[PDB]
Design a protein around this ligand. Structure first.
Ligand SMILES: O=c1ccn([C@@H]2O[C@H](COP(=O)(O)OP(=O)(O)O[C@H]3O[C@H](CO)[C@@H](O)[C@H](O)[C@H]3O)[C@@H](O)[C@H]2O)c(=O)[nH]1
Ligand SMILES: O=c1ccn([C@@H]2O[C@H](COP(=O)(O)OP(=O)(O)O[C@H]3O[C@H](CO)[C@@H](O)[C@H](O)[C@H]3O)[C@@H](O)[C@H]2O)c(=O)[nH]1
Ligand SMILES: O=c1ccn([C@@H]2O[C@H](COP(=O)(O)OP(=O)(O)O[C@H]3O[C@H](CO)[C@@H](O)[C@H](O)[C@H]3O)[C@@H](O)[C@H]2O)c(=O)[nH]1
Ligand SMILES: O=c1ccn([C@@H]2O[C@H](COP(=O)(O)OP(=O)(O)O[C@H]3O[C@H](CO)[C@@H](O)[C@H](O)[C@H]3O)[C@@H](O)[C@H]2O)c(=O)[nH]1
Ligand SMILES: [Mg+2]
Ligand SMILES: [Mg+2]
Ligand SMILES: [Mg+2]
Lengths: 312, 312, 312, 312
């Protein structure tokens, strides 16, 4: 059997494989447990699949999942986790930004009785106080969308129990906010604090288009809260628009409002706008219902059973 | 085999387990049938799981379903019923607000030939007029929503035959209105009147946000009637607007209306509003069809078969 | 092996069972083939079930499908079709409105090489002008909806081969229009003309709610053509508003408009209406895509195979 | 084991069976590989099926898939590919517009390692400049929507390896734009240039309705990019409308200048339009998420594996 699985999504990672595998060998041999390394080649346009083949031939603990195309880090991680067989699964980057030694600490927490063990940075320490603030506000927003309070500063480096992996695969989903989904599958969760290596500091171009795309997926692909905040703002600006339209009709009828000579335009505008806003609100509520239905999340998740066998 | 399955959703229920189990045993032993008790620990932060494990170790009829986190009473009950194997499932509350002595009565009615035996309070006896009038109107609205007339004053205390349990498990809906769903499975149903124990009161704080969210969920996640009343009234409004626009157009050509000099903003407003209202109505009708399809409700439900074997 | 299945939906059909079964046996005995009679009791409040059980005890060819609730004649017919194992299934009415003797003719047509053999009335007879006009208009609409030209004056009385029954069972859509579904799955189809009995030619009641809902289902639950005639008429209007909004912009920036200075109100009205109509068109197009995706109809329907085995 | 499958969709293709079936055997037999011809009779209202059955009796390699009605070229190709068991599936047209000798070249490129070998026309040639420009613009628009740039001037003549065929069958879409699906699943693709048959160029009168429907299927049934682009565009228009409404409120409050005395109409119009556009944008974003969920494409596609077995 396999106790630990290390999932490494790789995309154009030559000359990083030797160092990464040396570090993983330094880390995983003291553990004295059976492990495996699932390398997800995410359709690289670079001579790295050949080096992965060379490493796999000599080393019996390397398994390779070669994706047909380039799907992205999250999808490659999902593929590796689907193909992982260990009792615990640890996603790890191929650039060694997250130190592999923390695996041991993570594994220790896994033996303490926890199911998901996140690996959180002590602090950002390299962002220009704009990314820190935006991340803090966004994380408060999603935490108010969630009900598990996913720890801040958590990346993809973590440890999953087999129960959590099975629960994640139990969620049939195509638009997945992975942090929100992890919060949704609420098992015994914890985190361990680690400091990223000082060389690995702020050097990435935080292109705000993909950051905004990630924000939109987090806001919309996870929860209906942005859809329920609207259609509640709407039908308030619609009930308040049908009002002051009935009020306008009453004022015109009683006072005899013909100061312009044309006051039915405002009444028509307000009435049609309010009716259309109510229609859009009803459509939004039923679209949220359809979204919940098509997400097809399980009603519940059983963590343990005493005296009962697991339902298939 | 198991004849009866008592499903108790439990959340922070320590110091209530001893009394509840004593009453359950005192009620179930005279029945002289092979019963089972399934306790669904709904992610309690309290120390009830240890006591549940101890009682499962002592009593062999106790079974524990440990949900990953807190999913709510409804989802905990669904999880317990899914794991219930008895010929009749009785959902009960661990607070003993529903007297377990009624179970015998329910079973008696279940042996009379009925499939669903609800437990209904005779009178509210403790709730003010603001929680009686609203309840009454909500029940009339729901009764007009369905075609089976769910008896009023009904809680989760009930008896469900294995036929009804399998019928309910055949609904894969994620947005569930339990009262409407149980009305929808139109088996042979009846009620048993009982008086709630005067130990607890009806002055419980009404979190009207919750009593509005649940009401709107039952209204919106059960039937399409709110979406059918609109896109009908809305389409009627659109037809009236277009008729008024045509009449105004005529009154502009014949009779030569030029008194304001701009009696065409009204025409454009009315025409565009009517066109958008028809578009919204068509979108709403098709969204309703999409919702009915994604709910994936079975077309029919076979109660009994003579000369035939049940389809897979 | 069963050669013929006769599916009879029943609802308060007591006192017709004796005559119906007598006529059915008189018709079916000369055919000299094995047959079954599936009586689908649609949750009748009458004593129909007792007589059905007695007949099933007396006659071995009678099977009963007792639906739990009153689902409707269409859903009862569906429940009968799924539970019918004959090589050719004939839906018929328990009131003997359609003469059972036509079974013989249908069988001959089925043995000529046809897959669906409709039973069409020669004329409406009873109804004179209004019902015929409305039916002709509706049938023209639904004929332009599909591409297989279902014969007119058709009811639920027909013969369907096992191939057609399986093809229909390959459509797991809850919002179903059977008159259109039997055309969409088009096989070798034909019809036979039958003259309804003089008994069943009296004045008929037509509540314009069941008929109205039938028309709405035939319009919106069959295809996207009602949604595709709009999103074009709603988009031509949007284009014709954005144009002439540009024309008013030009007629204001050239030939400086001091004629009611508070013009360009119409520019805003037209521009916002056109943008909203383009939005409504885009949402309508994608909603139709979602609708036909959710319906999950098979892409094709193989009728015969030479040199190949049928796909599982 | 069949090393090559030739799928031929057919509709009213008589007087073309002998020529096609002579050229196909003139081409395939020199390859000395076990081939298989699968003729999908797409509901021809013609004697095509009888001659196909004659050829099926005559030759052991021709198999027939008969569809219940006329479904179209793409659906017939899907049916033929689903019934093809060869290691490489080569769709082909029965009118022989694309030379069958190119199959040899295709097979060579299949032996060279490539998974999808497109057969692309060298140039459109005969058709006019405006048609070529429209096709080029459409392909340029699609290229951004895709992930791997599909070769220009592609058709239904191609070679798909068994890997790619299994990947495409894994896509349970009902709204399939195949030219985009073959780029989404993108394996090791390549293309082979060829010229269409002489005298078979300048006789195609384009069906503007059919071309429009195909283009709209490509735009709307493949990607959400048009939806997201228009949602963004509506968001900018809504923000501009709200900002201009606020500016008008200022100008009518600050500076106190109300010139007409009836300019609240524009504020109401702008504000209601902006609110409705925000609501429509939210509805569109959630409809796109529902569309992505409903399409149910697999997150990833595995091409090769090392050390692991393929998941079921
Ligand atoms: O399409 C893919 C598929 C897989 N991986 C793998 O993902 C791991 C780490 O991904 P990476 O993007 O390098 O994360 P960081 O090293 O922390 O830096 C990132 O910092 C930003 C935060 O997401 C990203 O936008 C930048 O692309 C990237 O420099 C590595 O093993 C990669 O091989 C990718 O990066 N892109
Ligand atoms: O999130 C959960 C999960 C499980 N249970 C179980 O449900 C049973 C009883 O449910 P309870 O909520 O106490 O029923 P009520 O007696 O009707 O009291 C509640 O009824 C209201 C309507 O739900 C609630 O809003 C209030 O918390 C409370 O007054 C108990 O075994 C609990 O353990 C809960 O109550 N809440
Ligand atoms: O809810 C149900 C369930 C089953 N059946 C069975 O369906 C069979 C035939 O139905 P029936 O209503 O008797 O046929 P019609 O004589 O055509 O009655 C119709 O006559 C009108 C036009 O002729 C229609 O518009 C109405 O739907 C309906 O009243 C009968 O054996 C019934 O038992 C019903 O009628 N209603
Ligand atoms: O309903 C059907 C079913 C099957 N096939 C088969 O599809 C193959 C190729 O189709 P075909 O019509 O012969 O292609 P073209 O001769 O190129 O004609 C097309 O030329 C344009 C460029 O593709 C298209 O836009 C037009 O729709 C169409 O007239 C043929 O073997 C047919 O048998 C059809 O054409 N129509
Ligand atoms: Mg309680
Ligand atoms: Mg009748
Ligand atoms: Mg041609």
């Amino acid at each position: 059997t396999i106790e630990l699985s290390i999932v490494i999504p790789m995309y154009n990672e030559e000359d990083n494989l030797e160092h990464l595998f040396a570090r993983l060998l330094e880390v995983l041999t003291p553990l004295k447990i059976t492990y495996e390394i699932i390398c997800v080649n995410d359709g690289s346009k670079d001579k790295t699949l050949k080096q992965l083949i060379d490493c796999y031939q000599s080393n019996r603990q390397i398994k390779i999942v070669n994706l047909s195309r380039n799907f992205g880090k999250e999808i490659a991680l999902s593929a590796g986790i689907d193909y992982a067989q260990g009792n615990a699964v640890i996603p790890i980057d191929a650039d060694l930004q997250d130190p592999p030694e923390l695996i041991h600490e993570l594994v220790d927490k896994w033996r303490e009785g926890y199911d998901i063990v996140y690996a959180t940075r002590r602090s950002r320490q390299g962002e220009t106080w704009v990314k820190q603030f935006t991340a803090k506000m966004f994380y408060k927003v999603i935490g108010r969308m969630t009900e598990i309070k996913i720890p801040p500063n958590t990346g993809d480096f973590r440890l999953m129990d087999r129960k959590v992996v099975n629960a994640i695969k139990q969620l049939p989903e195509r638009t997945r906010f992975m942090k929100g989904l992890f919060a949704w599958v609420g098992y015994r969760q914890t985190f361990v604090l680690f400091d990223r290596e000082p060389r690995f500091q702020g050097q990435t171009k935080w292109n705000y288009w993909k950051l905004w795309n990630f924000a939109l997926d987090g806001i919309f692909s996870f929860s209906l809260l942005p859809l329920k905040v609207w259609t509640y703002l709407g039908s308030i600006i619609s009930l308040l628009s049908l009002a002051y339209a009935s009020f306008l009709i009453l004022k015109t009828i009683t006072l005899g409002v013909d100061v312009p000579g044309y006051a039915s335009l405002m009444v028509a505008i307000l009435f049609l706008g309010g009716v259309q806003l109510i229609s859009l609100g009803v459509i939004g509520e039923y679209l949220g219902r359809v979204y919940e239905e098509v997400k097809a999340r399980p009603l519940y998740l059983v963590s343990d059973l005493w005296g009962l066998e697991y339902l298939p």
